[PDB]
Subunit: 175 residues, 3 copies
């Protein structure tokens, strides 16, 4: 009867300093509340882009809070301080190249700079971790593209049961 | 001129028990016999989801049976026991990112969960190894997508000569 | 950026380096650069045999000593064992950019079925972006038209020199306030 807990991690020095409002994390939470039919809790965190803090935070959410899914936003570009993908790979046992490929494909429809994104996704135990973009609009387009495969992925790793509203996002399951 | 030997490996803890016939393996064999017009033999193996055994099987086929191409099916998903990609990476000295990229791309057209596939391809000596999915529909779109480049790839690594029926799938080759 | 823009063009070809073939690939890249860039820049041109150590040494020299902000290589990206340009590139970079190889193979497949045999990639070493291009002059332009729009901005982000392109030829996208 595993309970569904979804982690939302905003990685931004500015946001963590309070220099500006976290519209990215808000965009992710709003999206989840809007499309998920099944019951679920949220573990929200806003941290600066410190490599060690990112890894420690991902591990805490998966291991200690029992998250079945963790969505990050921020730190996925070419800049040297953007280490979210590095942190993600460092805490996962298996990576899923298909996520990064599709997210870049979808973004490319908007801007050619989509090829500069290093967003990825991987598995840590019964938890799926996915790197999302920063802009609320791009976050929506991104989730509409990958969410259809997320619930089933979590099923396959032993995570909590999640289902979405087919009228908004169809969670494909080989039935 | 090396003799053309093609390995077909079905990876499943179930199929290695006789729990059912091997539809996936048969689909691959039938495809090969249907499109290839040059002389070739098939080395068929059905093994469990054990990384070490998969590694040893691929090495046996490449090194001892002299396979120039090895096609695997099964164990490419997110589940922890799906270790075919890891075993493939372990025995190859050079990976080809283009294969997993295109295969997931064509598979995604009907299967949203295609982004959960960790299929890849690599080279071990003069043998090309390619990970295929388990479902027939996916196996077909994947082979139709990559086969046009397989014979030529084999030429470049010094493997045996293989050609296909252009009315089914044309194998590229320079003048 | 007050940085002086220096672009490296490295041809990795045993035959080109020995004087067997004319390097139409390197020439194609240089002509493309001069054709679309609307800002001042110098070119560090090198032609070398496909020796992994030399490839790594050359990339490192152009980035660390010549101060290149961009290095475009041509050759050695296929499945044959001697093609080790991607390996050398990953060896000298600290951060890879999967989107480059992905897009380049995607736009190439529309014309070359064996595009999936290409192992071209791109990565970052300090404030220098390194991108692997194909050998055929025709394929070089196709790959560049696809990825060049993202190159100047990527260089901005890593602290490299300022480069801009003629919007009528290639539009270098950059976010504006």
């Amino acid at each position: 009867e595993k309970k569904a807990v979804i982690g939302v991690v905003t990685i931004s020095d500015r946001a963590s300093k309070g220099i500006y409002e976290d519209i990215s994390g808000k965009a992710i939470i709003d999206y989840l509340k809007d499309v998920i039919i099944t019951p679920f809790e949220v573990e929200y965190r806003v941290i600066p882009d410190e490599r060690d803090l990112i890894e420690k935070t991902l591990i805490e959410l998966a291991d200690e809070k029992g998250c079945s899914l963790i969505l990050t936003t921020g730190g996925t570009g070419p800049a040297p301080r953007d280490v979210t993908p590095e942190a993600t790979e460092a805490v996962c046992e298996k990576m899923l190249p298909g996520f990064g490929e599709l997210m870049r494909q979808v973004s490319l429809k908007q801007v050619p700079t989509a090829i500069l994104s290093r967003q990825t996704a991987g598995i840590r135990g019964s938890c799926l971790i996915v790197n999302l973009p920063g802009k609320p609009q791009s976050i929506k387009v991104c989730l509409d593209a990958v969410m259809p495969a997320i619930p089933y992925c979590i099923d396959l790793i032993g995570g909590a049961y999640i289902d979405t509203d087919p009228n908004k996002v169809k969670a494909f399951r080989p039935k």
